[PDB]
Symmetry: C8
C-alpha cells in the first residue's frame, strides 16, 4: 500500500521481506524508489540490478506482481482505474501504475491501441492485452 510514494528505504524493507537482501544492496546502489520499482523491466534488472538469473528474475517479477495487485494507487489514480481493472479481472490490477504513468485515465481508454498497451503501458501478456482492449472498446 502507497507503493507509488515509496522511497528507497521502503524498497529495501520490501526486498528484505520478499527474500532479495543481496539485491537489496544492489537496489540501494541504484537508488530505486517506489516509482522506479513499479516501472521496472527485465532489461533494467539485468543491466543495472545484477539480476543475471532468468529464474530469479521470474521469482522477483512474481513478487512484484503480488505487490502491484495489492498496492494503493489513490495518490496517482484520479479516475480510479484500479477497481476498473480489478472488476475486469482481479489479476489485472497490477497494470494500474503502467496505465496511469502513461497519462491514461478512464476517459481515454477507448482510444488505446494494442501496440500502446504493449509498449507504453508495459502489458506483456497478449491474452491480458486483448481482454483489456476488449473491455476498453465496450465502454
Amino acid at each position: 500500500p502507497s507503493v507509488p510514494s515509496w522511497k528507497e528505504a521502503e524498497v529495501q524493507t520490501w526486498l528484505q521481506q520478499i527474500g532479495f537482501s543481496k539485491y537489496c544492496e544492489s537496489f540501494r546502489e541504484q537508488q530505486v524508489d517506489g516509482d522506479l520499482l513499479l516501472r521496472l523491466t527485465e532489461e533494467e534488472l539485468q543491466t543495472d540490478l545484477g539480476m543475471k538469473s532468468g529464474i530469479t528474475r521470474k521469482r522477483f517479477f512474481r513478487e512484484l506482481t503480488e505487490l502491484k495487485t495489492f498496492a494503493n494507487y489513490s495518490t496517482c489514480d484520479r479516475s480510479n482505474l484500479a477497481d476498473w481493472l480489478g472488476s475486469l479481472d482481479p489479476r489485472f490490477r497490477q497494470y494500474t501504475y503502467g496505465l496511469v504513468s502513461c497519462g491514461l485515465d478512464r476517459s481515454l481508454l477507448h482510444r488505446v491501441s494494442e501496440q500502446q498497451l504493449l509498449e507504453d503501458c508495459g502489458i506483456h501478456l497478449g491474452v491480458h492485452r486483448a481482454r483489456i482492449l476488449t473491455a476498453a472498446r465496450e465502454m
Copy 2:
C-alpha cells in the same frame, strides 16, 4: 499430483526420482519450485540450470510432460480446464498450467488466438495448437 503447490524440496525429490540428481543440485541453487517447474523453458534450462545437452533437455522435457499429464490442478483450475483438455486428447492435459497461468478459463477460450497459444501459453507443437484452437471455436 499437487505439482502447482510444490516447494523446492518436492522438486528435488522428483528430480532424484526421474534421474536428474546432478541437476537437482543445480535446481536447488536456482530455487525452482512447482510453479517455476511447470513454467520452465528451453532457454531457462540452458542459461540457468546447466542443461547444455539438447538430448538431455529432450529427456527432461519428456519427463516433465509425463508429470504435467498426471498432475492435480484443483488448486489453480477453477473452470476445470484439465478434463476439457484431456477430453480433447489425453496428452493435451499437460497444457493446463500454461493455460491457467495466462488467466484463461473455459469461458474465454473461444477468443484465444494461435499466436497467443504459441507465445503466452507455451504450446509449441503446431499440430497440438490447431486441435486446441479448433475445439475452442467449436464451443
Copy 3:
C-alpha cells in the same frame, strides 16, 4: 523391429552393427534410447553426439532411414499409419514415428498442413511432403 521400445543397450548394439562404434560411446554418454534415436536431428547429432562430419551424418541418416523403414510401430501406432505410408510409397514408412509423436492418427491427417509436416513431423523433403499432403486431402 520394436525400435520405439529400444533402451540404450539396443541403440549400442545397432550402432555397432551399422559401423558407428566410436559414436556408440558418444551415444552412451548422452543416454540415447529408441525414442530419442527415432526423433534425432542434424543439430542434435552435431552438438551432442560428436558427429562433426556432414558426410558421416549423411551415412548415419541413411542407416537411420533404413532402420525406420523396417521398424515395428505396433506399440505406438494405434491407427496403423505405417501401412498407410507404405501404401503411399514404401520409403514413406520412415515417417511413422515422426507422425505419431505429434499425436497424429489416420483421422486427423486431412487437416495437416505442409508447415506442420515440415516442422512438427520432421519431413524434410519437399517432394515427399507434397505426396503425403496430396494423399491426406484425398482421403
Copy 4:
C-alpha cells in the same frame, strides 16, 4: 524558468540541485547549456555524459521532465505552444522545446505526422503522440 537561455553555469546549478553533482562535472566537460539540456537524448547521455545506468537515466529524465514542465518558453515560443500543450494535458508542456526547435508553431501543427512527432520532435510515448496528433487535426 528561462531554461532555453541557460548557459553552462545554470546547468551546473540545476544538476547540483537535482542530485547529479558527479554528472555536473561530466556535463561541464561537455559544455552542455540550456538548449542542449532541453534537447538531450538517451544515446547522448550514455556516450558523452557518463550515465551508464538505465535506472539513473530514468531518474534524470524524470527530473528533466519536471524542469521542462515548469520552464518559461517566452523567448522561443512565438505562437505560445506551451499553454496549448498544457491545455491538452498539463504534462504535455514538456514537449514545447522539442516542438519549437523543429520550427513548428500553432499554424502548421495540423500537418504534423506521427513519424515527425516521434523522430524530429522527440515525443517517445505513443499514447502522448496520439493525443497531440488528435488535437492537432481537430484544430
Copy 5:
C-alpha cells in the same frame, strides 16, 4: 557405369583417374561411396573433403558431371528417367540420381515444382531447371 553401386574403392580409382589423388586420401578418410559421390555438394566438399579451392571445386564438379552423364542407372531408375532426360538434352542425364533419390519417377514429374528441383533434386542452373519443368508439364 554402375556408379550408384560403387563402394569406396571405386571412388578411389575414379579419383586417381581424374587427377584427385590427394583428395583420394581425403575421400577415403570420409568413406565416400558411390551414393555419396553422386549426392555431393559444394558445402560437403569444402567442410569435409579438404577442397578449399573454388577453382579446383569447379574442375572436380566438371569431372563429376562427366561421370554422371555416362553412368548406368539401371539399378535405381525403374521408370528409366535417364533416357527421358537425355532426350530432353544429352547434358540433362546428370540429374538422374538427384531425381530418383527424391523418389521421383516419370509418373509424378508433372507435379514437380521449380523450388523442389532447386532444393530436393539439386539442379542449380535456372536455365536447366526451366527446360526440365517445361517438359514435365508438357507430358
Copy 6:
C-alpha cells in the same frame, strides 16, 4: 558572408571565432575549405575531424547553421534561392548551398522529391522537408 568562396584560412579564423581551435588544427590537417565546410556531415566530422563527441557535434552544427543562415550565396545562387528559402522561413536559408550544390534552381524545384531533399540536398528535419516540398509544388 562569401562562405562558399572561403579557403582554408577563413575556416581556421571562423573555427577560432566559434570556439573550436583544437578542431581548427584538425580541420587544417584535412584541408577543409568553404565548400567542404558548407557540405559537412556527421560521419565526416566523426571519422576525419576528430569530433567524437555527439554533444560537441551538436554545438558545432548549431554554429554551422548560424553561419549558413547569414552567408552570402551570390557567387553560386544564380536563381537566388536564398531569399526564396528565407521567405519560406528565415531558418530555411541554411539549405541554400545544399540545394544549389545539387544543381537545383528555382525552376526545377517543383519536381524535387522528399527522398531527394533528404539524401542529395541534406535536409534532415522531416518537418522542414515537408514545408519546403509543400511550397515547391505550390509554385
Copy 7:
C-alpha cells in the same frame, strides 16, 4: 582464338602477353585452363588467384573481355550465337561462352529471363542484359 580449347600452357602464354606474369604463377598453381578462364569470376579471382586489388581485377577483366570478344567458339557454338551477339552489338560477343555453357542456343533464347542472364550466364551489366533480352523476345 580457340580459347575454349586452351589448356593451362596457353593460359600462361596469354597471361604473360597481357602483363600478368606474377598471376601466371598463381594460375598455374590453380590449374586454370581455357574453360575456367572463360568462366572466371571476381570471387574466384580474389579467393583462389591472389588478385586482391580491385583495380588490377578491373584491368584483368578488361583484358579478358578483349580476349572473349575475339575468341573462336566454333567448337562449342553449334547454333553460332557468336555472330548473333556481334550483330546485336560487337561488344556483346564476349557473352558467347557464358550463354553456351548454360546449354542455351539460338532456339531457346526467347524463353531466357533477365534473372537467368544475370545469374547463370554471368551478364552483369543491366544495360547489356536488357538489350540481349529485348532482341531475344523480338525473334
Copy 8:
C-alpha cells in the same frame, strides 16, 4: 582533353597538378590509366589507392568532376553524348564516359532506367538522374 586515352604518366602529371602527389605514388603502384581514372569509385579509392579520408576523397572527386567536365571524348563518343549532356546541363558532361562505357549512345537512351543510371552508369545524385531520365524519355 583526351583523358580516355591517357596512360599512367598522364595520370601522374594530373595528380601532381591537382595536389595529390602522395597518391600519385599510390596510383603508380596500381597502374591507374585514363580509363580506370574515369571509371573510379569510392570503394576502389579506399581499398586500393590509400585514400582513407572521406574529406580528401571529396576533394579528389571534385577535381575528377572538373576534369570530366572538360575532357575530350571524341575517341569514344560516336553519337556525341557529351554535347547532349552539356545542353541538358553544363555539369552533366561529367557522365559521358560512364554512359558510353555501358555501350549507351543517343539512340538507346530512351530505354535507360533509373536503376541502370544508378548502377551501370554511376550517376549517384538522384536529382541529376531524374533530369537525365526526363530528357531521355522526352526524345
